[PDB]
Amino acid sequence: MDVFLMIRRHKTTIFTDAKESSTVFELKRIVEGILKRPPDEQRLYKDDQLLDDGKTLGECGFTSQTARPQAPATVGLAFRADDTFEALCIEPFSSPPELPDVMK
């Protein structure tokens, strides 16, 4: 089963899919082909939880009926600069304006 994801760091957001049976480490290889940083310089998160390389995406809670094409699930991403890892930082999207009066 396919799961549909947004992989997010700072002001970067990757739209992609993967198998429920695929591993965290295999998702880092996907991020490597796009952002050119190797798996050992990546940390992946679900909310505040650091994800383990050998676990499947399904085991970590990304399932086909919660990670949907029209409403994809978020995976946090952090990079290692030099010796140590940065903290997880995901910039929020902009805020919608107030509803115009005719739409209230």
Partner 1 sequence: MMYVKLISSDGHEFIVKREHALTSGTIKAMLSNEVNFREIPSHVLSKVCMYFTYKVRYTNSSTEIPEFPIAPEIALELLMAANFLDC
Partner 2 sequence: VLRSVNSREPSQVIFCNRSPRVVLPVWLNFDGEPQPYPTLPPGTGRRIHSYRGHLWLFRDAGTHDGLLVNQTELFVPSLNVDGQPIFANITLPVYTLKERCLQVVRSLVKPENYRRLDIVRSLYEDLEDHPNVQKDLERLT
Binding footprint of partner 1 on the chain (CB under 8 A): 4, 11-17, 33-34, 68-72, 91, 93-97, 99-100, 103
The contact mask relative to partner 2 for 43-82 (x = CB under 8 A, - = no) is: ----------------------------------------
Site for partner 2 contains 103 (CB under 8 A):
yes
Give, in degrees to the nearest 5, the angle at Cα 103 between 100 and 104: 95
Calpha distance 51→39 (Å, rounded): 12
The contact mask relative to partner 2 for 83-102 (x = CB under 8 A, - = no) is: -----------------x-x
Query: Smallest distance from the beta carbon of 1 to partner 2, in angstroms?
Result: 21
Name every residue whose Cβ is closer than 8 Å to that of residue 21 and which is 6 or more positions away in sequence.
56, 57, 58
Calpha distance 4→15 (Å, rounded): 8
Query: Checking phi first, is residue 70 left (phi over 0); if not, alpha (psi -120 to 50) or beta?
Result: alpha
Q: Which does 102 bind (CB under 5 to 8 A by kind): partner 1, partner 2, none?
A: partner 2
